[PDB]
Design an enzyme around this catalytic site. Structure first.
Site, PDB file in Angstrom:
ATOM      1  N   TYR A   2       0.835  -1.200   0.000  1.00 43.31           N
ATOM      2  CA  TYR A   2       0.000   0.000   0.000  1.00 43.31           C
ATOM      3  C   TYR A   2       0.870   1.249   0.000  1.00 43.31           C
ATOM      4  O   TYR A   2       0.535   2.242   0.655  1.00 43.31           O
ATOM      5  CB  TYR A   2      -1.006  -0.031   1.176  1.00 43.31           C
ATOM      6  CG  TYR A   2      -1.787  -1.330   1.206  1.00 43.31           C
ATOM      7  CD1 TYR A   2      -2.540  -1.738   0.109  1.00 43.31           C
ATOM      8  CD2 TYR A   2      -1.735  -2.175   2.312  1.00 43.31           C
ATOM      9  CE1 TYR A   2      -3.234  -2.947   0.116  1.00 43.31           C
ATOM     10  CE2 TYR A   2      -2.434  -3.383   2.335  1.00 43.31           C
ATOM     11  CZ  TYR A   2      -3.181  -3.767   1.234  1.00 43.31           C
ATOM     12  OH  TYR A   2      -3.875  -4.960   1.262  1.00 43.31           O
ATOM     13  N   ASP A   8       2.052 -16.517   3.576  1.00 40.14           N
ATOM     14  CA  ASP A   8       2.429 -16.032   2.236  1.00 40.14           C
ATOM     15  C   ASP A   8       3.930 -16.133   1.988  1.00 40.14           C
ATOM     16  O   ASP A   8       4.588 -15.219   1.467  1.00 40.14           O
ATOM     17  CB  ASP A   8       1.913 -14.640   1.988  1.00 40.14           C
ATOM     18  CG  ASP A   8       1.850 -14.258   0.532  1.00 40.14           C
ATOM     19  OD1 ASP A   8       1.784 -15.171  -0.322  1.00 40.14           O
ATOM     20  OD2 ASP A   8       1.845 -13.058   0.252  1.00 40.14           O
TER      21      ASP A   8
END
Ligand SMILES: Clc1cnc(NC2CCOCC2)nc1
EC number: 2.7.11.24
Length: 345
Positions: A29, A142
């Protein structure tokens, strides 16, 4: 007199402590830069996060921050500093300051052949870091080459805990083809069949895929979409055994598997003809279809392939093991609260 630092059209507002910025790339982000730290007199990595308009971005920012501030481990990236405005009202961006690493395993695999000694050392450090993470009852969820940072002497640090969760194995079950967030090529087969990714075995599969990728410089299971990922996995592991199918009680998932023509196992030593035979034995055990039979982190560390490094007394665990419905305004207050210790005053 001087205003905020600019880099590529964006405000990158980190000064006066952090100067002499160079662009690196895009993060999740926001922008990633290096910077000279005038206190510790070293260059550092800085990531700009701007999550406050979205609850999912808020949740992930808070998770990362809470986990990384609790964790302390040589094979886990830390947080050195967090920069944000002094008031909730003026706080639009958060900057996270971390050790500057030379590269990551994704970049390294695209450009460098790894010696067997390098593969061994990288796998050791991954599993050592993962031991700690799992001992804290946390799942990374992840793990992939771009989330493994390397310095110029090949010390390795696990990063990006934005998709991490507390382990919750009694609520792991779900239906066939249930959507999932984590990176497609490193997803264990059970994700596509009947698992929410709430057990530690999810992370071991990913490490197995990373090990395979270190062996050939190519992803082992490069699927192009959701069910293609399972096509790739079965194409190497072959058809699951009756016993392994019996553990999948959900009928849609079982009957999908039963509908497929028989596929033979592809021997690891044919896929990886130059690989160390002990490396392939451990790979086989990490890439086991049945997650109940898959090797655990502490077993993996004790495997003969890692015998030169294995030392349980120097593979520490967490002292203190470890948000879905909280809205973004409360999550801002929690992020503001969690970052308060880095402020002046
Ligand atoms: Cl948190 C963090 C993020 N990136 C780095 N470094 C880059 C350098 C360029 O290659 C990829 C990694 N260091 C720390």
């Amino acid at each position: 007199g001087a205003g905020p630092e600019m880099v590529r059209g964006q405000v990158f507002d980190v000064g006066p402590r952090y100067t002499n910025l160079s662009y690196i790339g895009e993060g999740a982000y926001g922008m990633v830069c290096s910077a000279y730290d005038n206190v510790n007199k070293v260059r550092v990595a800085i990531k700009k996060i701007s999550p406050f308009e979205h609850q999912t971005y808020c949740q992930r920012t808070l998770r990362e921050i809470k986990i990384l501030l609790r964790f302390r481990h040589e094979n886990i990236i830390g947080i050195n500093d967090i920069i944000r405005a002094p008031t909730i009202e003026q706080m639009k961006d958060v900057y996270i300051v971390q050790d500057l690493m030379e590269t990551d395993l994704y970049k390294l695999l695209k450009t460098q052949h790894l010696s067997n000694d390098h593969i061994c050392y990288f796998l050791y450090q991954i599993l050592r870091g993962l031991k700690y993470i799992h001992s804290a009852n946390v799942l990374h969820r992840d793990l992939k080459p771009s989330n493994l940072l390397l310095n110029t002497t090949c010390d390795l640090k696990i990063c990006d805990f934005g998709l991490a969760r507390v382990a919750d194995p009694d609520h792991d079950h779900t239906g066939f083809l249930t959507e999932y967030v984590a990176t497609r090529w490193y997803r264990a087969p059970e994700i596509m069949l009947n698992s929410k990714g709430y057990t530690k075995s999810i992370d071991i599969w990913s490490v197995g895929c990373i090990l395979a990728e270190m062996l050939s410089n190519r992803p082992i299971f490069p699927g192009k979409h959701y069910l293609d990922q399972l096509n790739h996995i079965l194409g190497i592991l072959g058809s699951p055994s009756q016993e392994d199918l019996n553990c999948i009680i959900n009928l849609k998932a079982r009957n999908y598997l039963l509908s497929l023509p028989h596929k033979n196992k592809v021997p690891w030593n044919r896929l990886f003809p130059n690989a160390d035979s002990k490396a392939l034995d451990l790979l086989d055990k990490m890439l086991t279809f049945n997650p109940h039979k898959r090797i655990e982190v502490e077993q993996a560390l004790a495997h003969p392939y890692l015998e030169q490094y294995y030392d349980p007394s120097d593979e520490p665990i967490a002292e203190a093991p470890f948000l879905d419905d909280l809205p973004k305004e409360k999550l801002k207050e929690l992020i503001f609260e969690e970052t308060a210790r880095f402020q002046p005053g």
